[PDB]
């Protein structure tokens, strides 16, 4: 499903 948002996109 979803994964933890990182510090850069």
């Amino acid at each position, epitope marked *: 499903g*979803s*994964t*933890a948002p*990182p*510090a850069h*996109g």
Partner: antibody
Amino acid sequence: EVKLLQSGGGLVQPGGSLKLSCAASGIDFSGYWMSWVRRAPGKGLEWIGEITPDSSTINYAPSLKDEFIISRDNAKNTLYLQMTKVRSDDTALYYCVSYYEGFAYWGQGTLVTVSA
Amino acid sequence: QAVVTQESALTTSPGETVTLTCRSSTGAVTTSNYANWVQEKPDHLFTGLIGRTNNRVPGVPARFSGSLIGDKAALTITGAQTEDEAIYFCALWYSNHFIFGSGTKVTVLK
């Protein structure tokens, strides 16, 4: 109740090789970005690299991209960092971080001392 | 190689507001740089505060706010407290890597 346990490190002679481990418990490790940073004595924080949840793309800092190799085993809930052919200025406190809108969860940090 | 710059140190009093800046050498700091702010308290106690310019890691008090002030990224501690006395590091995303700043030694007068 999130804990990142680090192990490895210690004294290493110049030109040696070391491999640090970071075992995550309390989060769905498989779905978390991971990164390695280090704090040298007298220096600031230095970003080593980062690794996707699936290891699709791995990003190292351009300066030290040839010294370190980042890897992970989602099955074991463990993150690894292997430094090969270290130098004297690699002595520092190496920290294991997981991204969550930032450098959310940290490990206790393992000290690596490089000296002949 | 680009260089990230922050104030050498700052000094404030409990209750006041403080603003730390973070300047990129490549040009004006943009939202595409995804500014990050990390805090080191005594005894190598690192705790993340803000990422992606303004998103703060969950569970961090609201007095820490990330923004963009002109050409630099900014971390503003409004209503600072003694517990906020630490070293604040800045990180700027340069397409494929992070570059950490020298760090600002923020002092809150005990």
